[PDB]
Structure 1
Amino acid sequence: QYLLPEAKAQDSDKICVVINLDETLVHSSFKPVNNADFIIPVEIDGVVHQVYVLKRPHVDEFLQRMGELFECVLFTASLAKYADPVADLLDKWGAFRARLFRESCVFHRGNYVKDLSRLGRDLRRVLILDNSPASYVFHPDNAVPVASWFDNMSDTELHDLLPFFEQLSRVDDVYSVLRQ
């Protein structure tokens, strides 16, 4: 059994992109944040705590365009009790065709690894967007690096990455660009 079902007919010819959440699209902490974008109550050991969520700049332009260009998949090492509410609020266009959480990761030498071989997709047509190069140790030639984001509101990386994803969305084999 693979992590993903068969791609829907409107996704089948597109490239798959697995997209990280924390420090890629949003940043959260339990330390109170003024003027947060979302606050999500998250139960931990039977006590609800408020998780304060900041949206990385340009993330709506990014998700909205990505969902057109790709079969986008949320793939995070966090628990669904936190990720699903965040994703529900972020994904205003249905970009994420599937959601994969910590239980879908592989623990490898102290690190949760997104083993792309388990998605059920030709790896010539799979990309991973993740701020943590450890997340894609088994598939470095599938990766589009992105710097970890916390609160810098001057950041523009999601904006700056789009014309490159525009190119990638049209190739037959991502390795022809990323070299493998």
Structure 2
Amino acid sequence: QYLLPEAKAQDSDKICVVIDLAETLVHSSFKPVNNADFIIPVEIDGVVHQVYVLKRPHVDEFLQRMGELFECVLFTASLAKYADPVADLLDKWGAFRARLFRESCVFHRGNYVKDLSRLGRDLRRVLILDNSPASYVFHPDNAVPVASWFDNMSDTELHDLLPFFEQLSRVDDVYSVLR
């Protein structure tokens, strides 16, 4: 059983992009943040704790355009109860066609690895966007590196990566670009 169902008609000819959440698109903290973008109540051992979420600059534009260009899949190492409510608030456009969480990762040598072979998509047409090189150790030639983001509001990395993804969305084989 693959991680994804069969691609829907509106997605099957597009490249599939696996997108990480934490430190890629947003940064979440248990420490109080003034002027947070979202605050999500998360229950741990029956006690509610407020999680403070900041959005990376240019993420709305980035997520909107990627949802058009690609079959977008949220693939996080975190548990659904962190990731789900954040995605709900973030994905205004139905960009994420599927959500995969901690259970879907392989724990390999102390790292959560996102194993692209389990997806059920032709790997010539799969990309991964993740701030942790560790998550794509099995598929390093499918990857578009992005720097870890915490709270730097001068960051332009999501914006500067768009022309590149614009190009990748049109190719037949991602490996002809990434090697």
* Equivalent in the alignment of 1:130: 130
Deviation at 1:111, TM superposition (A): 0.4
Q: TM-score, normalised by structure 1?
A: 0.99
For structure 2, the 5+ residue unaligned runs are none
Deviation at 1:166, TM superposition (A): 0.3
* 1:114-146: CA deviation from partner (whole Å, max 9, x where unpaired): 000000000000000000000000000000000
* 1:63-109: CA deviation from partner (whole Å, max 9, x where unpaired): 00000000000000011111100000000000000000000000001
Q: Secondary structure at the match of 2:17?
A: strand
* Counterpart-to-counterpart distance in 2, 1:45 and 1:159: 39
* Counterpart-to-counterpart distance in 2, 1:139 and 1:15: 16
* Counterpart-to-counterpart distance in 1, 2:7 and 2:94: 15
* Counterpart-to-counterpart distance in 1, 2:78 and 2:40: 14
Deviation at 1:45, TM superposition (A): 1.3
* 1:40-70: CA deviation from partner (whole Å, max 9, x where unpaired): 0001111110000000000000000000000
Query: What is the 5 A alignment of 1:7-156?
Result: 7-156=7-156
* Counterpart-to-counterpart distance in 1, 2:81 and 2:164: 33
Q: Secondary structure at the match of 2:98?
A: strand
Q: TM-score, normalised by structure 2?
A: 1.00
* Counterpart-to-counterpart distance in 2, 1:78 and 1:42: 13
* Counterpart-to-counterpart distance in 2, 1:116 and 1:45: 32
* RMSD of aligned alpha carbons: 0.3
Q: Secondary structure at the match of 2:84?
A: helix
Give me the identity figure in percent: 99
Q: Secondary structure at the match of 2:32?
A: coil
Q: Secondary structure at the match of 2:124?
A: helix
* Counterpart-to-counterpart distance in 2, 1:135 and 1:43: 26
How many residue pairs get aligned? The number is 179
* Counterpart-to-counterpart distance in 2, 1:92 and 1:15: 21
* Counterpart-to-counterpart distance in 2, 1:20 and 1:82: 13
* Counterpart-to-counterpart distance in 2, 1:45 and 1:58: 35
Q: Secondary structure at the match of 2:167?
A: helix
* Equivalent in the alignment of 2:176: 176
For structure 1, the 5+ residue unaligned runs are none
* Counterpart-to-counterpart distance in 1, 2:44 and 2:34: 22
* Counterpart-to-counterpart distance in 1, 2:120 and 2:60: 28
* Counterpart-to-counterpart distance in 2, 1:19 and 1:33: 25
Q: Secondary structure at the match of 1:18?
A: strand
